């Protein structure tokens, strides 16, 4: 009953063919493709569920996904999880008008959360080392539970006010062993309230992003999302057929959350989004948006033109921008450690970042043309602190070889004076 | 009739062999090699025409070429076109004495040229924004034709003289939308006479260059040529057995345009 051809077509078919160098064909091939599941790739059919099935099988088997051609139509709000490498260089995703899903790139089970009643937090709160400039937590000297992990901690002391809401103590750092922290605490804290620990990978994973088609104008809050991930390298990615106007929408492309020790590469956006409201006034929209990251490098990013700032950061540590082409480098919640902008071309927005660290600039060019915007200059200088956080920057600013081009004439017409070099103030002291 | 052995060896094939993780072998392999066309790779035969045929097949199917060993002897002046990634790390090319060909790495219809009589050019020449330090071409504010492209434009005003020949106004920049330029003009121009626009890829291609053997000493004007290309990464490449003297010759290795 079992005849050749029927056996070859089945799962145990590649192990029956031998190679000249040794082994079998099955031994050589160890990855999965979209074509392995017969997914329609001409854009004529919704394949949201088919891609969902493919990712589930790959995660169970722990294999990589490789696909270098085809165009796929997706709709709804799916959540595709990926636990390993993903290569989609050459693939175009055609998003529907109501699409609100996202790829979920995460490092399986790498995160542990400790509450205020955990023994770890109580041991820390009962010992010293919680002063300014401290680099050792004395409660973890004789413990190994948190060894070799990235820590995202929160405290109980109020630091500043934003929009009338109190913000509390926090710190992002790395612990090697016996309580030693890579980055020293800048301010003291009375008690710790929560700890998030992320374990680094034992392997490097590669993400090759596809091309996203925005013809129907989706407005999701992030199409590519990285959560609880370490030791990854992101390359490629682009946007196509972006609409000129985005009335009453706030599109976000890439979002990061609880990531450490990674580097990004040549993402290309032909021009940023231009989102307005019913009164034809600019609203927020980000190409990149991250929260709670540490030890990150961004290289050869391309998003330059009119519109809102394309970068939004919050509560990060040791961020570096090298050889980028962006219209703004921004940080809402203050950073800690250092913030480096090297060999980068900047747009009319400049740099808006409150911080508890040092800012470094080297060989940076700023273009001040803002003709498309009528007025609408939120901060009156080129290098600014956040006016919605009080306008503070508890650190120094060091600039080398800065070049200024343009005039920003549209702002001068409304206000009567040109922009300032450095500005630091608050919109409302209450 | 239609035996299994004959069926397996044809274009039908790996599609009939299944993988343990799912799908077929055909679904996993999506590239081409020089061994796929039985090209002699010991330097004992000229294979200039054989390499040309392989590049034609890959361009039609939109596949990548990958070869990691062998030495090939080439001669003449062929123009091998490549529209996708090319991986020749570990391959040696033996160039004949009179070899004058090159590899052509292109982008497959990414360039548009506008002359002085085109409507786009006349729109720019009728408006302002052509002054020194200008970063916006006011004649393209309401146009979307050149959005998201690299522009290589030329002018009509003489800037300087070299060897008795006048050189004219020029600038290279990028246009995002509604006339905004990434790099400002350093000098004003009375009129613009030609614009070349290049569209960036929606993908990243990789080029891994081979090793070139210059034992016979060819003097062609560029063995690796890149024309009208964007978003690529070039890696590797080397020269071996270069002669110590090159009397009455001027060799060029890599050229970009």
XYZ file of C-alpha atoms in Angstrom:
687
model
C 0.000 0.000 0.000
C 2.948 2.296 0.736
C 4.368 3.253 -2.665
C 7.184 5.613 -3.579
C 5.984 9.102 -4.415
C 3.234 8.814 -1.830
C 5.960 8.405 0.798
C 8.135 11.097 -0.802
C 5.272 13.609 -0.770
C 4.703 13.060 2.951
C 6.576 14.525 5.902
C 9.265 11.813 5.741
C 10.318 12.610 2.194
C 13.436 14.753 2.493
C 15.248 12.153 4.618
C 15.098 9.672 1.708
C 17.322 11.789 -0.589
C 21.070 11.817 -0.037
C 23.667 14.502 -0.686
C 27.065 14.043 -2.314
C 28.903 15.703 0.584
C 27.068 13.535 3.126
C 23.795 13.455 5.019
C 20.345 14.034 3.570
C 18.337 16.947 2.200
C 16.332 17.114 5.441
C 19.502 17.760 7.452
C 20.387 20.749 5.263
C 16.996 22.507 5.362
C 15.951 23.749 8.806
C 13.697 26.778 8.206
C 10.090 27.557 7.299
C 8.551 29.764 4.616
C 5.165 31.295 3.886
C 5.016 29.206 0.699
C 5.277 26.096 2.899
C 1.651 26.731 3.939
C 0.317 27.754 0.488
C -0.432 31.379 1.352
C -1.947 33.480 -1.433
C 0.671 36.118 -2.256
C -0.911 38.272 -4.978
C -2.960 40.474 -2.633
C -6.294 39.098 -3.870
C -7.302 37.365 -0.615
C -7.236 38.124 3.101
C -4.569 35.892 4.652
C -4.644 37.199 8.224
C -5.525 33.798 9.697
C -3.113 31.885 7.449
C -0.135 33.933 8.653
C -1.383 33.365 12.207
C -1.292 29.590 11.690
C 2.206 29.736 10.184
C 3.686 31.644 13.132
C 2.182 29.222 15.666
C 3.797 26.193 14.006
C 7.197 27.898 13.765
C 7.111 28.910 17.438
C 6.311 25.349 18.534
C 9.170 23.905 16.463
C 11.532 26.799 17.234
C 12.437 27.532 13.605
C 13.093 30.686 11.598
C 10.752 32.157 8.986
C 12.157 33.137 5.584
C 10.188 34.736 2.750
C 11.613 36.997 0.048
C 8.665 37.708 -2.276
C 4.912 38.128 -2.439
C 2.292 40.673 -1.410
C -0.235 39.860 1.311
C -3.529 41.503 2.270
C -4.321 41.586 5.996
C -7.171 43.053 8.051
C -8.564 43.008 11.571
C -6.507 43.079 14.767
C -4.313 39.958 14.860
C -1.367 39.406 17.194
C 1.372 37.419 15.444
C 3.995 36.204 17.956
C 7.554 35.475 16.846
C 10.060 33.847 19.208
C 12.970 33.481 16.752
C 14.490 35.138 13.691
C 12.219 36.569 11.003
C 13.351 37.457 7.472
C 10.829 39.297 5.282
C 13.180 41.313 3.059
C 11.304 41.648 -0.227
C 7.793 41.064 1.169
C 5.070 43.713 0.936
C 2.183 43.770 3.420
C -0.967 45.485 2.136
C -2.798 46.763 5.211
C -6.553 47.232 5.111
C -8.206 50.475 6.191
C -9.310 49.021 9.527
C -6.158 47.050 10.309
C -5.047 47.397 13.933
C -2.863 44.322 14.506
C 0.887 44.000 14.825
C 3.803 41.600 14.790
C 4.853 40.632 18.325
C 8.619 40.027 18.465
C 9.452 38.793 21.962
C 11.970 36.601 23.779
C 9.565 33.869 24.934
C 9.714 33.788 28.758
C 12.488 36.177 29.802
C 10.704 38.541 32.220
C 9.999 38.237 35.944
C 8.092 40.856 37.951
C 8.580 41.356 41.695
C 5.964 43.181 43.740
C 6.285 45.255 46.913
C 5.645 42.185 49.100
C 8.239 39.989 47.380
C 11.206 38.869 49.514
C 13.612 40.472 47.027
C 12.098 43.952 47.372
C 11.850 43.685 51.166
C 15.514 42.670 51.391
C 16.519 45.714 49.328
C 14.371 48.130 51.339
C 15.813 46.891 54.654
C 19.434 47.678 53.704
C 21.447 50.675 52.552
C 22.891 51.655 49.206
C 19.853 53.717 48.137
C 21.681 57.070 48.109
C 22.694 59.374 45.281
C 25.754 58.182 43.392
C 25.425 54.639 44.736
C 26.460 51.785 42.472
C 25.813 48.831 44.786
C 22.556 47.624 46.344
C 23.597 46.212 49.717
C 20.506 43.998 49.966
C 21.652 41.874 47.011
C 25.323 41.420 47.962
C 24.728 37.887 49.299
C 22.087 36.911 46.722
C 22.198 35.474 43.204
C 18.535 35.743 42.152
C 18.996 38.889 40.026
C 22.487 38.113 38.698
C 23.145 38.867 35.037
C 19.889 40.672 34.262
C 18.554 44.039 33.137
C 16.524 45.768 35.855
C 13.670 48.259 35.418
C 12.837 49.574 38.891
C 10.303 52.034 40.292
C 10.149 53.934 43.564
C 7.787 55.792 45.893
C 9.201 59.348 45.855
C 7.701 62.054 43.650
C 10.245 63.617 41.289
C 8.245 66.021 39.096
C 4.782 66.844 37.765
C 3.467 66.447 34.214
C -0.036 67.611 33.234
C -0.896 67.725 36.929
C 0.111 64.083 37.481
C 2.883 63.063 39.865
C 5.782 60.987 38.539
C 7.776 58.642 40.755
C 11.353 57.420 41.126
C 12.733 55.013 38.525
C 15.995 53.549 37.240
C 17.046 51.319 34.333
C 20.366 49.521 34.788
C 22.172 46.177 34.581
C 23.268 43.935 37.461
C 26.310 41.696 37.021
C 26.582 40.020 40.442
C 26.625 40.666 44.210
C 24.528 43.796 43.881
C 26.798 45.749 41.525
C 24.984 48.039 39.084
C 26.457 49.137 35.763
C 24.936 52.632 36.026
C 24.943 54.483 39.337
C 21.771 55.926 40.828
C 21.497 59.687 40.421
C 18.913 60.313 43.164
C 18.137 58.542 46.403
C 14.916 56.664 47.084
C 13.077 55.804 50.289
C 11.659 52.476 49.077
C 11.440 50.307 45.959
C 7.965 49.295 44.789
C 8.427 47.152 41.660
C 11.257 45.416 39.791
C 11.190 44.058 36.230
C 14.058 41.749 35.249
C 14.937 40.669 31.699
C 17.383 37.823 30.989
C 19.683 38.253 27.962
C 19.589 35.725 25.145
C 22.164 32.997 24.596
C 21.913 33.667 20.845
C 21.623 36.563 18.395
C 18.381 36.857 16.420
C 17.984 38.860 13.216
C 14.889 40.784 12.117
C 14.697 41.785 8.448
C 11.617 43.967 8.226
C 9.224 43.868 5.253
C 7.834 46.752 3.219
C 4.586 48.161 4.616
C 2.018 49.520 2.156
C -0.071 52.397 3.538
C -2.338 53.069 0.564
C -5.600 52.760 2.495
C -4.214 54.864 5.354
C -4.224 52.751 8.514
C -3.736 54.424 11.888
C -2.601 51.633 14.190
C -0.633 52.304 17.375
C 2.378 50.363 16.116
C 2.677 47.756 13.364
C 6.003 46.268 14.532
C 6.229 45.791 18.302
C 9.214 44.476 20.269
C 8.487 43.447 23.866
C 10.848 41.959 26.466
C 13.658 41.316 23.995
C 17.454 41.393 24.083
C 20.383 40.840 21.708
C 18.563 41.410 18.425
C 19.562 43.222 15.236
C 16.922 44.948 13.102
C 17.681 45.700 9.448
C 15.617 47.092 6.600
C 11.980 48.092 6.492
C 10.198 50.827 4.575
C 6.870 52.569 3.994
C 5.179 52.947 0.609
C 2.222 54.936 -0.746
C 1.910 57.019 2.414
C -0.986 59.502 2.134
C -0.172 63.199 2.134
C -2.740 63.955 4.863
C -3.885 61.928 7.882
C -6.881 63.898 9.177
C -7.860 62.778 12.698
C -5.352 59.910 12.851
C -2.103 59.246 14.736
C -0.207 56.459 12.946
C 2.712 54.724 14.661
C 5.042 52.346 12.820
C 7.573 50.783 15.210
C 7.157 50.450 18.977
C 9.623 49.132 21.556
C 9.060 48.222 25.197
C 11.445 46.681 27.756
C 14.341 46.046 25.371
C 18.089 46.135 25.936
C 21.421 45.565 24.176
C 20.303 45.826 20.553
C 21.061 47.826 17.421
C 18.834 49.037 14.585
C 19.787 49.755 10.991
C 18.728 51.275 7.696
C 15.004 51.826 7.968
C 13.874 54.079 5.107
C 10.829 56.364 5.158
C 10.432 58.517 2.008
C 8.688 61.240 4.039
C 7.057 61.426 7.486
C 3.340 61.527 8.158
C 1.383 64.798 8.199
C -1.529 64.354 10.607
C -4.057 67.104 11.343
C -7.366 67.489 13.173
C -10.729 69.029 12.291
C -9.212 72.519 12.660
C -6.315 71.651 10.296
C -3.736 71.846 13.098
C -0.872 69.384 13.463
C -1.201 66.422 15.832
C 1.307 63.826 16.976
C 2.533 60.874 14.902
C 5.711 58.832 15.292
C 7.787 56.627 13.026
C 9.679 55.309 16.072
C 8.365 55.197 19.636
C 10.011 53.406 22.548
C 9.581 53.074 26.309
C 12.012 51.648 28.877
C 15.011 50.718 26.734
C 18.712 50.592 27.561
C 21.968 50.346 25.579
C 20.463 51.017 22.153
C 22.147 52.079 18.907
C 20.309 53.540 15.906
C 22.178 53.803 12.607
C 21.282 55.033 9.112
C 17.653 55.857 9.924
C 15.950 57.897 7.192
C 12.821 59.912 8.005
C 13.162 63.569 6.992
C 10.598 66.127 5.894
C 7.586 68.110 7.030
C 5.298 66.989 9.833
C 5.464 66.014 13.477
C 8.623 64.708 15.095
C 9.282 61.111 14.076
C 10.960 59.946 17.316
C 9.315 59.639 20.717
C 11.261 58.310 23.686
C 10.551 57.810 27.371
C 12.539 56.559 30.377
C 15.600 55.253 28.544
C 19.316 54.832 29.223
C 22.440 55.168 27.047
C 20.880 55.980 23.675
C 23.109 56.580 20.645
C 22.213 57.991 17.223
C 24.839 57.597 14.500
C 24.671 58.546 10.806
C 20.916 59.150 10.982
C 18.670 61.435 8.914
C 15.721 62.457 11.098
C 13.619 65.573 11.576
C 13.671 65.358 15.391
C 15.300 63.541 18.302
C 12.941 63.660 21.254
C 12.389 62.293 24.763
C 9.236 62.983 26.789
C 10.145 61.313 30.060
C 13.738 62.138 31.021
C 16.617 59.874 30.055
C 19.523 58.817 32.254
C 23.141 58.022 31.495
C 24.208 59.611 28.210
C 22.519 60.647 24.966
C 24.754 60.793 21.889
C 23.897 62.290 18.493
C 26.854 61.779 16.153
C 27.192 62.550 12.431
C 23.447 63.149 12.140
C 21.346 65.518 10.038
C 18.425 67.070 11.917
C 15.225 68.808 10.866
C 13.485 71.957 12.027
C 12.435 70.517 15.402
C 15.997 69.974 16.609
C 16.323 68.184 19.946
C 13.670 68.180 22.691
C 14.802 66.149 25.701
C 14.588 66.561 29.440
C 17.185 64.440 31.154
C 19.179 63.407 34.189
C 22.365 62.824 32.220
C 24.727 64.337 29.675
C 24.026 65.172 26.029
C 26.759 64.919 23.385
C 26.620 66.388 19.875
C 29.318 65.985 17.224
C 29.164 66.957 13.535
C 25.427 67.674 13.462
C 23.637 69.709 10.789
C 20.276 71.372 11.471
C 17.901 72.579 8.743
C 15.419 75.159 10.010
C 12.952 75.439 7.105
C 9.373 75.170 8.404
C 7.314 76.664 5.577
C 4.612 73.974 5.544
C 3.753 74.637 9.186
C 2.184 78.059 9.566
C 3.384 78.803 13.067
C 3.153 75.947 15.558
C 6.568 75.986 17.210
C 6.070 74.160 20.507
C 9.568 74.993 21.798
C 11.215 78.254 20.788
C 14.796 76.944 20.547
C 16.829 74.369 18.657
C 17.997 72.401 21.718
C 15.167 72.331 24.242
C 13.989 70.812 27.485
C 10.432 69.539 27.764
C 7.977 72.330 28.543
C 5.372 69.858 29.811
C 7.782 68.402 32.402
C 8.940 71.693 33.953
C 11.787 72.477 31.563
C 14.581 70.934 33.637
C 17.751 69.159 32.513
C 19.972 68.071 35.422
C 23.105 67.663 33.344
C 25.487 69.247 30.893
C 25.341 69.840 27.148
C 28.492 69.476 25.036
C 28.422 70.468 21.357
C 31.186 70.071 18.767
C 31.037 71.281 15.148
C 27.384 72.296 14.826
C 26.164 73.592 11.455
C 23.039 75.716 10.952
C 21.201 76.143 7.645
C 17.824 77.678 6.907
C 16.007 80.528 8.610
C 12.629 79.308 9.993
C 10.851 82.332 8.546
C 7.334 81.004 9.187
C 7.885 81.072 12.955
C 9.424 84.556 12.835
C 6.371 85.984 11.061
C 4.029 84.893 13.864
C 6.325 85.632 16.820
C 8.481 88.513 15.558
C 11.889 87.037 16.434
C 13.981 84.079 15.227
C 14.482 80.871 17.198
C 16.835 80.616 20.160
C 19.836 78.315 20.450
C 19.023 76.751 23.843
C 15.638 77.049 25.558
C 14.418 75.717 28.906
C 11.084 76.800 30.388
C 7.676 75.553 31.508
C 4.298 76.070 29.850
C 2.369 76.251 33.142
C 3.832 76.254 36.650
C 0.633 74.766 38.125
C 4.931 6.119 -19.591
C 5.757 9.011 -17.231
C 7.915 7.010 -14.845
C 8.700 8.385 -11.396
C 12.419 8.634 -12.144
C 11.824 10.739 -15.253
C 9.301 12.909 -13.395
C 11.703 13.603 -10.518
C 14.470 14.914 -12.801
C 12.383 17.488 -14.683
C 11.107 20.925 -13.681
C 8.708 18.938 -11.539
C 10.829 17.676 -8.723
C 11.448 19.015 -5.219
C 7.758 19.983 -5.311
C 7.130 16.214 -5.043
C 9.354 15.879 -1.938
C 7.944 16.906 1.433
C 9.723 18.371 4.445
C 9.270 17.276 8.051
C 8.463 20.799 9.256
C 5.912 21.291 6.471
C 5.750 22.248 2.819
C 8.028 20.917 0.097
C 11.690 21.267 -0.822
C 10.725 23.562 -3.713
C 9.244 26.008 -1.190
C 12.609 26.301 0.597
C 15.019 26.796 -2.331
C 14.509 30.096 -4.160
C 17.946 30.999 -5.563
C 20.163 30.109 -8.519
C 23.813 29.109 -8.872
C 26.366 28.847 -11.655
C 26.392 25.073 -11.106
C 22.693 25.075 -12.067
C 23.782 25.589 -15.700
C 26.828 23.250 -15.740
C 29.429 25.976 -16.246
C 33.016 24.735 -16.511
C 34.806 26.020 -13.408
C 38.445 24.943 -13.697
C 39.726 27.640 -16.072
C 40.083 25.244 -19.014
C 37.292 26.750 -21.152
C 35.932 30.189 -21.995
C 32.534 30.591 -20.328
C 31.703 34.201 -21.198
C 28.501 33.273 -23.042
C 27.466 30.759 -20.369
C 27.567 33.359 -17.582
C 25.493 35.709 -19.747
C 22.751 33.093 -20.150
C 22.583 32.491 -16.391
C 22.069 36.190 -15.629
C 19.199 36.390 -18.131
C 17.264 33.588 -16.416
C 17.671 35.082 -12.934
C 16.568 38.535 -14.102
C 13.394 37.126 -15.676
C 12.411 35.194 -12.538
C 13.660 37.842 -10.096
C 15.955 35.470 -8.195
C 19.338 35.823 -6.512
C 22.582 34.320 -7.818
C 24.899 32.524 -5.390
C 28.189 30.776 -6.178
C 30.944 30.135 -3.641
C 33.740 28.329 -5.515
C 35.400 27.732 -8.860
C 37.620 29.635 -11.279
C 36.212 30.902 -14.574
C 37.994 32.118 -17.706
C 36.331 35.011 -19.539
C 37.166 37.100 -22.595
C 35.628 39.687 -24.886
C 33.391 42.597 -23.920
C 30.205 41.182 -22.373
C 27.724 43.246 -20.376
C 26.258 40.998 -17.673
C 23.125 42.590 -16.147
C 22.092 41.884 -12.558
C 18.851 43.221 -11.065
C 18.984 41.516 -7.641
C 21.473 40.323 -5.034
C 24.724 38.705 -6.168
C 26.941 36.521 -3.959
C 30.298 35.559 -5.499
C 32.392 35.282 -2.318
C 34.966 32.589 -3.044
C 34.921 32.763 -6.863
C 37.946 33.706 -8.971
C 37.562 35.297 -12.409
C 40.476 34.751 -14.802
C 40.565 37.721 -17.185
C 42.076 37.310 -20.637
C 44.535 39.799 -22.107
C 41.897 41.532 -24.229
C 38.978 41.329 -21.806
C 36.895 44.512 -21.754
C 33.551 43.472 -20.222
C 31.962 44.215 -16.875
C 29.169 43.360 -14.471
C 26.206 45.757 -14.535
C 24.298 46.078 -11.243
C 21.113 48.063 -11.865
C 17.708 48.748 -10.285
C 15.344 47.736 -13.132
C 13.511 50.946 -14.147
C 14.224 53.317 -11.271
C 15.291 56.390 -13.300
C 13.289 59.075 -15.109
C 14.855 61.888 -17.150
C 13.237 65.283 -17.772
C 14.448 67.604 -20.511
C 14.248 71.393 -20.764
C 10.890 71.196 -22.572
C 9.178 68.958 -20.009
C 6.211 70.434 -18.098
C 7.891 69.678 -14.756
C 11.012 71.682 -15.612
C 9.015 74.629 -16.970
C 7.009 74.724 -13.731
C 10.184 75.139 -11.665
C 11.618 77.805 -13.985
C 8.469 79.960 -13.753
C 8.501 80.261 -9.945
C 10.925 81.325 -7.227
C 13.068 79.394 -4.799
C 16.092 79.373 -7.135
C 18.249 81.597 -4.902
C 21.326 80.837 -2.825
C 20.495 79.080 0.428
C 16.995 78.145 -0.740
C 15.668 74.823 0.508
C 12.274 74.818 -1.223
C 11.374 74.867 -4.919
C 8.171 76.922 -4.882
C 7.171 75.626 -8.321
C 6.637 72.105 -6.945
C 4.613 72.969 -3.828
C 1.353 71.543 -5.211
C 2.979 68.807 -7.327
C 3.510 65.188 -6.291
C 5.449 63.932 -9.333
C 8.932 63.998 -7.763
C 8.000 63.090 -4.179
C 10.475 60.787 -2.449
C 13.194 60.706 -5.114
C 16.859 61.611 -5.496
C 17.382 64.471 -7.958
C 20.487 65.079 -10.090
C 19.804 68.391 -11.829
C 21.909 70.653 -14.043
C 21.884 74.365 -14.779
C 22.728 76.906 -17.478
C 25.174 79.250 -15.704
C 28.937 78.829 -16.021
C 30.654 78.204 -12.679
C 34.332 77.704 -13.589
C 36.713 76.599 -16.335
C 38.787 73.417 -16.562
C 41.245 72.784 -19.416
C 39.542 75.572 -21.340
C 36.095 73.944 -21.134
C 33.272 75.652 -19.259
C 31.437 73.781 -16.503
C 27.818 74.525 -15.652
C 25.607 74.739 -12.582
C 24.724 71.474 -10.842
C 23.341 70.084 -7.592
C 22.350 66.699 -6.121
C 19.697 66.504 -3.407
C 16.619 64.640 -2.164
C 13.004 65.836 -2.309
C 10.581 64.589 0.345
C 7.301 66.312 -0.588
C 5.794 69.672 -1.624
C 9.082 70.993 -2.941
C 11.251 70.601 0.163
C 14.918 69.779 -0.451
C 17.162 68.000 2.036
C 20.278 69.965 1.012
C 20.020 73.689 0.331
C 21.331 75.244 -2.867
C 24.676 76.966 -2.368
C 24.375 79.105 -5.516
C 21.432 80.505 -7.418
C 20.674 79.550 -11.008
C 18.793 81.325 -13.786
C 17.239 78.166 -15.249
C 17.386 74.383 -14.892
C 17.989 72.377 -18.063
C 17.874 68.701 -17.036
C 16.689 66.648 -14.051
C 17.442 62.975 -13.357
C 15.267 61.287 -10.722
C 16.054 57.970 -9.011
C 13.491 56.089 -6.900
C 14.735 54.272 -3.778
C 14.139 50.545 -3.492
C 11.518 48.924 -1.274
C 14.153 46.335 -0.327
C 17.859 45.964 0.445
C 20.106 44.086 -1.991
C 23.534 42.687 -1.146
C 26.598 42.417 -3.390
C 29.504 40.138 -2.454
C 32.304 40.758 -4.925
C 34.559 37.996 -6.306
C 38.341 37.793 -6.681
C 39.820 39.062 -9.954
C 43.005 37.576 -11.423
C 45.029 40.201 -13.311
C 47.817 37.861 -14.422
C 47.465 38.716 -18.112
C 47.094 42.432 -17.351
C 43.830 43.748 -18.781
C 43.159 47.483 -18.899
C 39.389 47.766 -19.186
C 37.623 50.879 -17.871
C 35.914 49.243 -14.888
C 35.188 45.579 -14.202
C 32.429 46.182 -11.608
C 29.973 48.912 -12.614
C 26.999 50.150 -10.576
C 24.482 52.358 -12.392
C 21.242 53.976 -11.191
C 21.151 52.059 -7.916
C 19.970 52.765 -4.377
C 19.859 50.943 -1.037
C 22.607 48.384 -1.599
C 25.543 47.079 0.429
C 28.788 46.077 -1.298
C 31.150 43.726 0.534
C 34.383 41.946 -0.300
C 36.400 41.757 -3.491
C 40.129 41.558 -4.152
C 42.812 41.606 -6.846
C 45.462 38.918 -7.306
C 48.613 38.510 -9.412
C 48.780 42.177 -10.381
C 51.830 42.902 -12.573
C 54.422 45.323 -11.240
C 54.310 47.467 -14.405
C 51.395 48.544 -16.608
C 53.168 50.222 -19.544
C 50.726 52.236 -21.693
C 47.644 51.082 -19.770
C 45.149 52.606 -17.331
C 43.104 49.921 -15.565
C 40.014 50.693 -13.490
C 38.400 48.212 -11.101
C 35.163 49.608 -9.634
C 33.039 52.419 -11.073
C 29.805 53.939 -9.762
C 27.283 56.173 -11.515
